[PDB]
């Protein structure tokens, strides 16, 4: 499905983007949708 | 060119947001004046 594989943020990836944000490193993934960027 | 740049307004507000909070953004400018 292209609709539910559009983003790569899984629940395990979302824990990882939040971890690098708190430890002040840059993860390779970055939010794209507007409410995802909020 | 115009289609090569990924910078819309909705990307440009996001690049200046990640630059200010120092997290770093995935996109980066490629033109000379974009890097200024």
Resolution, given in Å to one decimal, reads 4.0
Listed residue (B22, B16, B19) closest to A24, CA to CA: B22
- Cβ atoms within 10 Å of A15's Cβ, excluding its own: 10
d(CA A22, CA A3): 29
State the Cα angle at A30 between A27 and A32, rounded to 5°. Answer: 175
- Cβ atoms within 10 Å of B1's Cβ, excluding its own: 4
A36 min Cα distance to partner chain B (Å): 12
* A33 in Cβ contact with A7 (< 8 Å): yes
A and B: number of Cβ contacts within 8 A: 13
Listed residue (A6, A32, A2, A1) closest to A17, CA to CA: A32
* A9 in Cβ contact with A29 (< 8 Å): yes
Contacts of A27 (CB under 8 A, 6+ apart): A16, A17, A20, A21
- Cβ atoms within 10 Å of B7's Cβ, excluding its own: 15
Experimental method: cryo-EM
Among A21, A24, A30, beta carbon nearest to B25: A30
Listed residue (B26, B25, B28, B31) closest to B2, CA to CA: B31
Name the residue in chain A with its Cα closest to that of B22.
Answer: A24
């Amino acid at each position: 499905q292209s609709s539910e594989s559009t983003n790569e943020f899984g629940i395990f990836n979302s824990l990882w983007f939040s971890l690098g944000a708190f430890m002040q490193q840059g993860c390779d993934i970055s939010p794209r949708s507007l409410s995802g960027r909020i």
